[PDB]
Amino acid sequence: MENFQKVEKIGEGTYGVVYKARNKLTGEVVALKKIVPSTAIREISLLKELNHPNIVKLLDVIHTENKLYLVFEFLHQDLKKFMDASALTGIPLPLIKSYLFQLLQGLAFCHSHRVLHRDLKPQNLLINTEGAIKLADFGLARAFGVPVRTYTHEVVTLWYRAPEILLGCKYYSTAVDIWSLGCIFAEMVTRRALFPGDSEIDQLFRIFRTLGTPDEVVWPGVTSMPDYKPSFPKWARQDFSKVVPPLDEDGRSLLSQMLHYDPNKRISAKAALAHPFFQDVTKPVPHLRL
Numbered sequence: 001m002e003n004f005q006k007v008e009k010i011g012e013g014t015y016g017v018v019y020k021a022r023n024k025l026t027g028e029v030v031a032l033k034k035i036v037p038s039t040a041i042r043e044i045s046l047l048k049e050l051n052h053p054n055i056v057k058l059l060d061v062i063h064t065e066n067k068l069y070l071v072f073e074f075l076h077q078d079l080k081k082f083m084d085a086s087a088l089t090g091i092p093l094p095l096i097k098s099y100l101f102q103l104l105q106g107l108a109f110c111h112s113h114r115v116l117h118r119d120l121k122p123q124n125l126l127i128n129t130e131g132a133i134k135l136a137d138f139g140l141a142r143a144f145g146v147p148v149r150t151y152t153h154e155v156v157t158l159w160y161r162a163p164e165i166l167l168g169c170k171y172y173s174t175a176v177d178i179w180s181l182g183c184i185f186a187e188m189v190t191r192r193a194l195f196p197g198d199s200e201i202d203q204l205f206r207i208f209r210t211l212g213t214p215d216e217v218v219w220p221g222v223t224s225m226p227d228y229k230p231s232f233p234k235w236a237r238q239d240f241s242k243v244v245p246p247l248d249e250d251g252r253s254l255l256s257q258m259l260h261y262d263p264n265k266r267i268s269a270k271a272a273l274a275h276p277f278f279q280d281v282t283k284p285v286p287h288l289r290l
């Protein structure tokens with residue numbers, strides 16, 4: 001750590017404080033995350049090889065005095081702040097489309113290597129002046145797990161959690177990230193969180209109220225999931241036309257596939273990239289005020 005000079009604290013992550021820092025040597029500006037079980041060391045070490053333009057680069061891993069520091073590429077802003085800043089007029093569709101496309105590219109890459117994010121949310125989607133967007137903290141969940149509360153006791157958001165996780169599925173897979181990204185896509189379009197649950201049951205019920213209570217017809221095997229209860233209220237499904245107006249038919253079709261209840265039926269990142277919604281994708285420059 002003596003090799004770095006802390007510039008400023010940029011936030012409190014799930015596992016620890018996040019700092020903007022400067023390599024006292026190379027002069028490189030980086031993000032320093034303060035987080036050891038050999039299991040974690042090896043898993044994190046594998047992440048250093050998982051490189052892609054839409055994944056925040058993990059530069060180095062520092063284990064000292066039984067402490068763990070992850071050194072990452074630094075990005076100036078996250079999607080949460082950007083969305084808050086674009087609240088008045090909303091993010092232009094072409095930019096939404098570009099961001100979704102890039103994020104799907106990142107997902108396609110990680111998933112192809114059987115690596116899941118598991119905790120996608122606007123806070124960990126980082127952007128730059130060049131119009132790029134990248135997934136941050138990829139793989140840390142499997143490495144350190146996902147706590148209910150952060151090291152600061154802050155509540156970990158459930159808003160983007162897939163239903164199979166909420167229902168107690170132990171071996172969920174890559175489809176969980178597609179669900180999360182679908183929720184984020186909807187949020188960018190509407191300027192409001194899709195399912196802002198404040199408890200596991202409230203999260204589940206919010207999903208049910210919109211997409212309908214899942215049954216054996218739409219999701220074979222659902223009634224057998226660990227946390228499924230026959231006593232769940234039975235709500236009818238809403239038209240996406242009512243959910244994400246005024247997203248066009250192509251966008252609504254794509255969103256519907258990313259939000260399929262059955263994880264096996266949910267669209268993959270790779271297939272999503274081929275959806276007609278991206279026929280006219282471009283790469284606009286966002287207006288960032290740093």
Ligand SMILES: N#CSc1cnn2c(NCc3ccncc3)cc(-c3cccc(Cl)c3Cl)nc12
Nearest residue numbers: 010011018031072074075076077078123124136
């Ligand atoms: N970690 C890492 S690598 C990382 C690299 N940049 N970065 C940013 N940059 C955007 C930024 C935000 C505020 N001030 C300056 C820059 C935020 C977080 C982060 C901070 C808090 C929570 C979460 Cl979820 C994340 Cl992702 N992590 C990172």
